[PDB]
Amino acid sequence: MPTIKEGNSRELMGQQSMPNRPNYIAFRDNFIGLMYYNSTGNMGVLAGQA
Amino acid sequence: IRGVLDRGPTFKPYSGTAYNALAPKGAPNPCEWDE
Amino acid sequence: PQWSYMHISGQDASEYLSPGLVQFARATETYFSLNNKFRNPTVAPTHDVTTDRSQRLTLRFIPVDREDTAYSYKARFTLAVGDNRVLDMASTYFDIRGVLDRGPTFKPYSGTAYNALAPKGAPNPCEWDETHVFGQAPYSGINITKEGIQIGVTPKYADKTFQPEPQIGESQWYETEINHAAGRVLKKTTPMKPCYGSYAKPTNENGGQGILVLESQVEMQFFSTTELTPKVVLYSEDVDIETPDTHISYMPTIKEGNSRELMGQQSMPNRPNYIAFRDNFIGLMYYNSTGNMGVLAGQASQLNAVVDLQDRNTELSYQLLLDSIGDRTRYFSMWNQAVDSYDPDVRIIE
Amino acid sequence: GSIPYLDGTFYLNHTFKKVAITFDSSVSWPGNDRLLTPNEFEIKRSVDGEGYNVAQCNMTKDWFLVQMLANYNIGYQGFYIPESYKDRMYSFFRNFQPMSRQVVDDTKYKDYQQVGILHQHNNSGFVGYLAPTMREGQAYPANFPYPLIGKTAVDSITQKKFLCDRTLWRIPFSSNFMSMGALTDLGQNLLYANSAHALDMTFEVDPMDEPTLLYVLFEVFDVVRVHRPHRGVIETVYLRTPFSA
Amino acid sequence: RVGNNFAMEINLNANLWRNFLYSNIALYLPDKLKYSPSNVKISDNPNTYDYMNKRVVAPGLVDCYINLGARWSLDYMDNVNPFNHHRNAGLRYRSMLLGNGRYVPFHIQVPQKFFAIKNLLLLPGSYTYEWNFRKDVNMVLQSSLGNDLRVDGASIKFDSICLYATFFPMAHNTASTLEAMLRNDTNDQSFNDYLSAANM
Amino acid sequence: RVGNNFAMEINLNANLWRNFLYSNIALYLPDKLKYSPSNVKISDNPNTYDYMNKRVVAPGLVDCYINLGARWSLDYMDNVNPFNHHRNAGLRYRSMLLGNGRYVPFHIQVPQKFFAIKNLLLLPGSYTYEWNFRKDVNMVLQSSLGNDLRVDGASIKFDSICLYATFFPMAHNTASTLEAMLRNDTNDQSFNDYLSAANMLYPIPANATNVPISIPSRNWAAFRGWAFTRLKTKETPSLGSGYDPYYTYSGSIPYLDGTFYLNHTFKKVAITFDSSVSWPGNDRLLTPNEFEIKRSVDGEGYNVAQCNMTKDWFLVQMLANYNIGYQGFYIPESYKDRMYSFFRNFQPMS
Amino acid sequence: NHGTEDELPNYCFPLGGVINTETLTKVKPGWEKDATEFSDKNEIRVGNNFAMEINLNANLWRNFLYSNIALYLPDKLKYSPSNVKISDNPNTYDYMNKRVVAPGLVDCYINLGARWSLDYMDNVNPFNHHRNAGLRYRSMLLGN
Amino acid sequence: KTAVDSITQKKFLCDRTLWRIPFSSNFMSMGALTDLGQNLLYANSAHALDMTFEVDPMDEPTLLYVLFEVFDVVRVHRPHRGVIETVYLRTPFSA
Amino acid sequence: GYNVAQCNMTKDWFLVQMLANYNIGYQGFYIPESYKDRMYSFFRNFQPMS
């Protein structure tokens, strides 16, 4: 970025462009993190209904 | 489970650009300025 | 009580389940398997395998004798197997330290370390007699006086031992007409070499390479058009120019010393040549050699248990044995176990 | 990013130097003069201790033998590569990566100059300065790096290290470190049957310029037994031992 | 034309090697080796994509000639998490399973991992089965740069959740016989957790 | 700008292919196809790096268009050792284990390979264990170019040697019981060498083709059969020698390491007991008095598998290696077809 | 399509390193000319060298997509060449070889960031391709 | 359409392995101690052997390497503390 | 709602294919042993995409 200055100018013809870094975003392997385990306040339940 | 995800604006699943990748990286577009 | 009930110890499921469930499960395993729902204990023996007495796992032995010839050495140990021990000889090895010099033809790569992106016949900026200069001035300064190029501010001038730096140049692609330019140049007393492959050791902590003789001998050279102010200062210097890993692929003249023709020479990287110990350290120990025979004998008892023959091939037998029992594509550093191979697409061109 | 604690993407195992294990303030474990340094487990040694290193890196003979025995039962009848079906994704030998390099010896190379990135030039004229931007500058003999080969190779020093990503380091509670049943021989010993014992462990690690965590897994039996005596009834007895909740 | 043709010269293989080292190593160097760009606004928050993307690294830090002839990981990179990278093929695949865009309606099947029930053979009855699910984007998502997705605009709505269960179509006499055996206490099922550790 | 932009044109893929062929094939062509550089001093000793590095090869000898559309090894390269190459990945790895510089302090563990003791369980006692070690850089090192490292400046100092041994911490009562059992003669240990062969080498002078050998009358009871290959004498140190003053090569040594690559140079072998009893005889083979390995055009009817190998030889190799040949030919199970086995290495080409 | 590792610019350069030189004369200290010492016509480049720029990785990716996908697209997406005779029989090599396909149909940016087969290619037999390695090998067994 | 008149050449490589001719009456592996090795013909007499190899010519000295496959065996006796004794037998081709 | 495995294949079809090819589907879905999942088998060739 050749200048601090704002707006079009001969100097701006000198600017150079670089691609942005890749960044994949996904769910995790085996969907780790979706379900709570090992957390006393968010404990799962399996019980007879009665 | 079904739902809707928005990966947000920093998701970029590739290297490089989609747009004019063969242009030299400092070549300007045809343009006009004041002096 | 509780270990048995939780199946940490005690009976396997085939004994503790009801015999009907056992029969039923065995009969139906291929339809709907039940084995993963019933724990089976595994319990280590607690007597008669190991000792709880004090005892080293590994012993180290220092030689009782070493003999050297110009081509071999011999190392003798007294290997002691204490009472109430046994020793599997496959657990033994020689632990060797030393110093290797692979010598000057070791080159563990293709290509050059030095200016690899230069065109292979591009000269460095240089000077020769017929005095002529071929050079470049990429640095743009405020002004030039007999003090050299001004670099900023009272006026401040290039420190000639490293400025202008050859890595630095104008920042934008478009023509700009530089009124006051500087660069570095090799004096005519430095041998001409292509840029590609060129290296000269730094002589200051700021990366300059000028030969010290200890003060700097850098001399400023001033230039203008053929029609009065200088437009270019060149900082001329001798450097200890080397080509540590390239050679000349085109040498225009038999003639010695710098010349316009030498600007035409071309540089090619040296061939790679890896140097190492061999797979499985083949060659370090003598086998199958009646004059250099190994010994294993009782210390009291004089008679060597090793008898070898010149028509036996111990090294090749080990190569074949290893391939028969394991996957030679995998490597193990401890025995330098990394099989010689080739690129299938080099051996047969497809 | 990845969360090693949950996903197993471990990558800092090479930062360990040693661990000393002591029961009841002063009973070193394993003791019994078992190890070449017998009061602690030394994982790696620097130059001064190189005689006890192994496998062409700075890992110690003792640590390599405990890891090989813990993972594969290999170490008393020679070291060899384990069967591939025993050497899984997160196992020791699959992940073990010894490495070495030379570098200029800045005390013995008489002509040494500490030239930093601001003043290194190699491909001047043909690359950007300090950035991935437009070529700039002029062709010139390179001043860096120092050559470590050929007839003017500089005086050099050797450095050795290893990586061992994905796996956990393992010290089994078994009298020869071998797997001989899940319920180990030492776990069944009278010494641990009848008394209680305190335990101290002291780890030495390489310094890192951010907060880190030692993650110790104390290996136990973690078991549940499930009883379904009547329609829509499910009952469970849990037992984790030792470290019962 | 008198003489040879006009030609320019490029080292292809050196360039390809340079590009690979810059993309996969230089850009991932610890931030203390980078610097902030000139004449460009950058975030003040190092956890952001904008900061990670705009911090500048000099290519000469991992150039073509880096430890030439050696097999050697950079000391600077040994303690950087190697899985946070665009060449993590599992993460790339998981990203590509959802698609190539930021906006994704999703439909997934999530398995039960708790050792006491994940292989249980459950007998006739009606049972309550309830579980709790996270919404934090930094837990439920994963990125290759590891940026803070709470500040970097990701979000997620979980619209529906159903429980599916599959039953072997067992002969009814056999099923009732099996059930009766499995209700006796000598035939209680038992399970050990695989890791079998208290974690500190 | 009026019109299209100024552009230059480069075939990228053709260039990359050209560079691969020049680096990995042209530069390794036999020296008789190369020439000495103009206006450049070169060594007079073809075993040197300087000679191997400066000899010039024309790229058009293995250009982009070499046997285009074919899978074909160059006849010029078939008899060049393929393991002596910078794409030998085992050798590259072993070179990189030491580091990237010519100066290396080293620390290695060297295993015992002699079959009579390498798996011995050694009982209580004190034993002398002594072995002899080489110092010749052409034996103890390996290079990818195979240059003579004696003249090319490599050297090595072996500073220290220790013996390490590891002992299972056996319960003492069990160890003493085991020892006592193992001292009885019915419980003597025994070992067979893996290769299980008496190894002979017979000279084949340059350009010779007929190689007759004779074994004098002796007893053959228990003989298991024959295995054979061809070696370069330049690559094969003299047997059993303390030091071979005429060994001027440091590449792979097939005799010791198993990097065989001249098997395709065999045409046939005739085996005869007692002057005139052909073996196997009994009208077994399609050419019944000899083993024909390959046939030229004139005998193509008896060739097989789309190359010039004979049906008979293919059947003997398949049977010898895998027991395949009487109930059809098929690919052997991969666990039976190891690194040095026949079918894994068999490469027909046209 | 994970795009291309083109972060660094790639340049070609003149054979002599530099080409647009100024002819200059050595001067000495106020300033005056030199001669018999230094030549009065020295060739010196002021500024950076003349360079042209090529995206290598984008080009290699483009070539791979054109050779292995664009050229195999269904014929309904192609067109017949201008000023060139072509066979009337679509089953012929001449027709298959001369039908023209626009590279922009499977360019560098095709479904960028996705793992996705083209709907146009899902129902095209994938084994009829020069990257069928079994068929290439069987062709090479006979010769070239 | 203007392909030149051509000839075909065929060959093979077979690197890494040794060529093998087992002393077994159908060439198959049916025990290490082969059927022919146990035959009366080889039990009671001595026999001389000639082998004649034909090879392609090479413009340097080479060596025929023949491995004559035998039993190469050692038996190890440890009758007393610090005593180790060995009996070797290679047969045929006893040393 | 009745699709599975992140593509448009149905739960039912996936279960019939898994059972027909590998006997997998009543005690969980998992990747079959590689020696059972040959060149022309269902799971080796199954390629969901979005």
Curated annotation (Swiss-Prot), chain G:
<protein>
    <recommendedName>
        <fullName>Hexon protein</fullName>
    </recommendedName>
</protein>
<comment type="subunit">
    <text>Homotrimer. Interacts with the capsid vertex protein; this interaction binds the peripentonal hexons to the neighboring penton base. Interacts with the hexon-linking protein; this interaction tethers the hexons surrounding the penton to those situated in the central plate of the facet. Interacts with the hexon-interlacing protein; this interaction lashes the hexons together. Interacts with host dyneins DYNC1LI1 and DYNC1I2; this interaction might be involved in intracellular microtubule-dependent transport of incoming viral capsid.</text>
</comment>
<comment type="similarity">
    <text>Belongs to the adenoviridae hexon protein family.</text>
</comment>
<comment type="function">
    <text>Major capsid protein that self-associates to form 240 hexon trimers, each in the shape of a hexagon, building most of the pseudo T=25 capsid. Assembled into trimeric units with the help of the chaperone shutoff protein. Transported by pre-protein VI to the nucleus where it associates with other structural proteins to form an empty capsid. Might be involved, through its interaction with host dyneins, in the intracellular microtubule-dependent transport of incoming viral capsid to the nucleus.</text>
</comment>
